[PDB]
């Protein structure tokens, strides 16, 4: 049918002030910090013990929730500059046979570097915080997301998916063949896979309303450009949510002159896990700052250099965004 075009006309169900206060009060940065983030602050490049531990951690944290998440592990082999390696994308889906999903994503691998001093790269912004933000969103909205389990003809056929990509980082020199291992694999698989099952023509990529990719988040004073015109209206919703939460007194250490979501765009093309989706026509909201964090790809990309209030603030904005999108 014309269902793959529904995303083009889809509108948010905007939350009122008292709902905004409830969402702000319902997320806990200290609980995220201890229970979702700190266990991921480990070396976790492909095939390392930390890769397996990261995956177990993400999966166990989703499995304890009441909403009916369906977990799948998309495991495959690829040649790399270091020789053949195994990669595992984690896909967590509410209502897997719904035609449409809003997709939130990040990479859970860490870049490989040799141990300078007695120090290891743990990629706190890149992307342990994004992962933790997705896990906290799933926990904080769990009661609301539990209502998607209820079938109803008064609601679009739309639900939520989380993707935690493996192998985003280059092993040696970033290039088309050394980078994006997980996302290139998963976009190709999805493009090839009928959706809904038994359909003619339409693939799982037609089902992706919008790919919201979080990356390099956790530094103070981030500035996110509005990268793409086909997601500019959704970006402007993040600006509006930020502004309203500010005005209601629900953000912390936040000024309108230091706001995160900016009017301007970006002069180049940033390569990331969204590329294999974007080149096949999926709309993307790329929540990556420009400039990148000062600590990018250094041993100082660590817990000490994260900003609690910034991440808390962004948690509130993202949670509101997702509820508005899904009409919850
Ligand atoms: C998105 N992301 C996460 N961590 N690093 C990145 C970007 C990915 C794209 N990047 C590059 N793009 C084109 C050519 C080279 C790079 C690059 C990638 C990795 C690296 F370590 N150095 C340069 C910059 C870093
Ligand atoms: Zn990186």
Tokens representing residue 216 in the block: 């390099």
Phi, psi of 243 (to 5 degrees): -65, -45
Domain ranges, residue 165 = 1-328
Q: How many helices (H) and strands (E) does the chain have?
A: 10, 6
**Other Cβ atoms within 10 Å of 147 Cβ, number:** 12
Nearest ligand to residue 176 Cα: 1
Burial (CB count within 10 angstroms: exposed 0-12, middle 13-18, buried 19+), residue 257: exposed
Length, in residues, of the chain? 328
User: Taking the CB of residue 227, how many other CB atoms lie within 10 A of it?
Assistant: 20
| Beta bridge partners of residue 70, listed in sequence order | 93
Domain CATH code at residue 203:
3.40.630.10
Element (H, E) at 244: helix 232-247
Q: Distance from the CA of 309 to the center of ligand 1, in angstroms?
A: 27
- Rounded CA-CA distance 327/321 in Å is 10
CA distance 245 to 240: 9
In angstroms, this model's resolution equals 1.7
User: Pocket of ligand 1, candidates 108, 271, 295: which has the most ligand atoms within 8 Å of its Cβ, to mutate?
Assistant: 271
Instruction: Count structural domains, the chain.
Output: 1
Residue among 273, 268, 295 nearest 286 (CA): 273
Distance from Cα 122 to the centre of ligand 1, integer Å: 16
For 295, counting Cβ atoms within 10 Å of its Cβ (0-12 exposed, 13-18 middle, 19+ buried), the class is: buried
Catalytic residue among 36, 109, 166, 168: 168
- Ligand 1 within 6 A of 215 CB? yes
Q: How far is the CA of 126 from the centre of ligand 2 (A)?
A: 5
Instruction: Determine contact, residues 151/60, Cβ cutoff 8 Å.
Output: no
Residue with tokens 């192998």, as numbered in its chain:
167
297 Cβ closer than 6 Å to some ligand 1 atom = yes
**DSSP sequence for 161-187:** EEEEES--S-SSS--SSSS-HHHHHHH
CA distance 16 to 127: 32
Task: Give the ligand at the shortest distance from the Cα of 123.
Answer: 2
């Amino acid at each position: 049918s014309a269902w793959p075009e529904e995303k083009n006309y889809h509108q948010p169900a905007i939350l009122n002030s008292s709902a905004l206060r409830q969402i702000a009060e319902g997320t806990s940065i200290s609980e995220m910090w201890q229970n979702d983030l700190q266990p991921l602050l480990i070396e976790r490049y492909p095939g390392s013990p930390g890769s397996y531990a990261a995956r177990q951690h993400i999966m166990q944290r989703i499995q304890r929730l009441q909403a009916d998440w369906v977990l799948e592990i998309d495991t495959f082999l690829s040649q790399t500059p270091e020789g053949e390696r195994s990669f595992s994308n984690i896909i967590s889906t509410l209502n897997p046979t719904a035609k449409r999903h809003l997709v939130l994503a990040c990479h859970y691998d860490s870049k490989y570097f040799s141990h300078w001093n007695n120090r290891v790269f743990v990629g706190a912004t890149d992307s342990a915080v994004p992962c933790a933000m997705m896990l906290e969103l799933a926990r904080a909205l769990d009661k609301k997301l539990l209502s998607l389990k209820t079938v109803s003809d008064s609601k679009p056929d739309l639900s939520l998916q989380l993707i935690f990509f493996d192998g985003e980082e280059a092993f040696l020199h970033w290039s088309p063949q050394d980078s994006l291992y997980g996302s290139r694999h998963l976009a190709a698989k999805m493009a090839s896979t009928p959706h809904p099952p038994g359909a003619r023509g339409t693939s799982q990529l037609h089902g992706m309303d919008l790919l919201v990719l979080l990356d390099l988040i956790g530094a103070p004073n981030p500035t996110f450009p509005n990268f793409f015109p086909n997601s500019a209206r959704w970006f402007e919703r993040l600006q509006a949510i930020e502004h309203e939460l500010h005005e209601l007194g629900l953000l912390k250490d936040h000024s309108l002159e230091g706001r995160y979501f900016q009017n301007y765009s970006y002069g180049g093309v940033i390569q990331d896990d969204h590329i294999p989706f974007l080149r096949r026509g999926v709309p993307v909201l790329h929540l990556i700052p420009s400039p990148f964090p000062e600590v990018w790809h250094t041993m100082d990309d660590n817990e000490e250099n994260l900003d609690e209030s910034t991440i808390d603030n962004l948690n509130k904005i993202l949670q509101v965004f997702v509820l508005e999108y899904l009409h919850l």
